[PDB]
Amino acid sequence: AQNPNCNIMIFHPTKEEFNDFDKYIAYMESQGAHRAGLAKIIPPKEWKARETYDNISEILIATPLQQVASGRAGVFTQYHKKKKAMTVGEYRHLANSKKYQTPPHQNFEDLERKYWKNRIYNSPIYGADISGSLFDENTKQWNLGHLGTIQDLLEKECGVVIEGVNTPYLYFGMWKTTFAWHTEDMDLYSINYLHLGEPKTWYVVPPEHGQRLERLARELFPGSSRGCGAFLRHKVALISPTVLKENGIPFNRITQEAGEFMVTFPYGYHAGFNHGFNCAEAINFATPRWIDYGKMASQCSCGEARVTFSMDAFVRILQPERYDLWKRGQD
Ligand SMILES: O=C(O)CNC(=O)C(=O)O
Ligand SMILES: [Mg+2]
Ligand code: NI
Ligand SMILES: [Zn+2]
C-alpha cells in the first residue's frame, strides 16, 4: 500500500504532465496521495494562471463575513456576521490596516502559535464564496474554470443525465480568517489555487480516520451534536492541533504559498487559516473513485447547512433513501 502513514505529498509535474488533469490526479492517487486527505501540487515553472494581478481591485465582495468566535482558544465555533459590500481594493486596505494586519513574526511556526493563541480575541473579515474566476481564458492547463463537471462525471460513470452546474469560487482572506473543519459537499474533491498574497495553513485528517475526528467533535461540541447528526456540515467548528494531539487524532499540516495548488480528497476533513491578505480560487470536482464516497456521505437535514442547487441531483441519484429528509432540510 502506498503512503501508509498518510503523509501529505507534494508533487512537481512537468509541463507535459500538466496537460491532462484527470490523468495526473489518478497518478497522484497511484502514489498514495489520497491517503493524507490533502496534496500540494507545484505547477511547472513555464506555467502561469494569468499575466498579472494588477487589475483586480474592482471585483466586488457583496457580503463580506466577520468571523466571530465563541469558546476557548483551542476549541471554538465561529459565526459569520454579514457586513456591507466592499471592493477588493477596499478589502485589501482593510486587511493591511493596523487593526487587521498580520503581526510581526519569525517564521510560519511562530505565526501558527500566535494564531492558535489569539484567534478567538479578534473577528477578521473574509470575502468568501464569490462566484467567479481569475484564470485567464487562454490558460489551458489546470484552469479551474475549465474542468470537467461533476454532472458530466456522474453521467459518464452511472449513465444518468442530471441538471446542475459546477463553477469556481473566489476567496479573499486576511490574517486570522478561518476555514472550519469540514469535508466537501457530498464528500467531493476540492482543488484550491492560491493566486496571490500571503500563505494559507491547512490541517487535514486522513480519510480513513475521519470518523475519529467526528467522534471528538461530538464530545467537544455536545449541544451541536444533539442538534444535528452531521453538524460539521455547518462549517463552524474549530479544534486546534494541540487539542487534536491530546486526543490522539491523526492529522497533518502544511502551508500553501502563492502559486501553489492544493487538492483535498473525498472525505478528507480539513481546516485552516490565512496568514494575511490573499486571494484563492477553489472548485469541487469528481473522479470515478469519488462515486462510492458520494453514496456514503453524511448529510445535514437540520436546516443549517443550506447548499447549492446542484447538490439536489447528487442526493437524489446517489442517496435516494435520504433524499426526502434532506430536501425538507433545504426547504
Ligand atoms: O480557502 C478556504 O477558505 C477554504 N477552502 C477549502 O475548504 C477548499 O479549497 O476545500
Ligand atoms: Mg477589478
Ligand atoms: Ni474545503
Ligand atoms: Zn445540520
The DSSP line for 72-131 is ETTEEEEEEEE---EEHHHHHHHHTSTTTSPPP-SSHHHHHHHHHHHGGG---EEEEEEE
Cα separation of 220 and 210, whole Å? Answer: 15
Give the nearest ligand 1 atom to 177 CA.
Answer: 3
Beta-carbon count within 10 A of 246 CB = 11
Ligand 1: which residue has its CA nearest to atom 9?
A: 192
Whether ligand 1 lies within 6 angstroms of the CB of 280 is answered as yes
Task: Compute the residue count for the chain.
Answer: 331
Residue 275 marked ligand-binding: no
> Can you state the angle between helices 311-318 and 150-158, rounded to 10 degrees?
20
Residue 327's H or E segment, with its range, is helix 320-330
What is d(CA 275, CA 65) in angstroms, rounded to the nearest whole number? 17
Contact 164, 309 (CB under 8 A): yes
Find out whether 243 and 12 touch, Cβ atoms under 8 Å: no
Residue type, 89: G
Known binding residue 300? Answer is yes
CA angle 270, 21, 307 (to 5 degrees): 45
For residue 259, how many other CB atoms are within 10 A of its CB?
14
Residue nearest to atom 4 of ligand 1 (CA): 179
Contact 284, 188 (CB under 8 A): yes
Pairing of strands 38-41, 261-264: antiparallel
Count the neighbouring beta carbons within 10 Å of the beta carbon of residue 211. Answer: 12
Nearest alpha-carbon partner for 297 in 271, 268, 267: 267
β partners of residue 301: none
CB atoms closer than 10 angstroms to residue 155: 13
Report the distance separating Cα 194 and Cα 188, nearest Å.
20
Query: Which among 129, 171, 254, 263 is the best mutation to test ligand 1's pocket, defined by most ligand atoms within 8 Å of the CB?
Result: 171
Instruction: Determine the atom of ligand 1 nearest the C-alpha atom of 126.
Output: 3
C-alpha–C-alpha distance, residues 78 and 241, integer Å? 17
Q: Is 228 annotated as ligand-binding?
A: yes
Q: Are 294 and 236 in contact (CB under 8 A)?
A: no
Instruction: Kindly give the distance from the C-alpha atom of residue 271 to the centroid of ligand 1, in angstroms, as a whole number.
Output: 8
Query: Would you kindly state where each structural domain of the chain is located, as residue ranges?
Result: 1-331
Please give the C-alpha separations between residue 197 and each of 54, 120, 235, 276, in angstroms, as whole numbers. 12, 23, 24, 7
Q: Which residue's CA is the nearest one to ligand 1's atom 3?
A: 179
Helix (H, G, I), strand (E, B) or coil at 190: strand
Task: Check: CB of residue 45 under 8 Å from CB of residue 17.
Answer: no
**Which residue reads 487589475 in cell numbers?**
55
Task: Work out the number of other CB atoms within 10 angstroms of the CB of residue 115.
Answer: 22
| Cα distance between residue 253 and residue 203, in whole Å | 4
Nearest 5 degrees, angle CA 320-CA 181-CA 122?
A: 140
For residue 64, give the C-alpha cell: 463580506
Q: Phi, psi (5° rounding) for residue 206?
A: -55, 140
Cα–Cα distance measured from residue 74 to residue 321, given in angstroms and rounded to the nearest whole number: 37
Report resolution (Å) to 1 decimal. Answer: 1.5
Which H or E run includes 281?
Answer: strand 278-285
What fold characterizes domain 1-331? Jelly Rolls (2.60.120)
Question: Who's near 115: CB < 8 A, 6+ residues apart?
Answer: 176, 201, 273
Kindly identify the ligand whose nearest atom is closest to the C-alpha of 236: 4
Q: Which residues surround ligand 4, an ion (CB under 5 A)?
A: 228, 300, 302, 304
**What 3-state class would DSSP assign to 274?**
strand
Residue type, 179: F
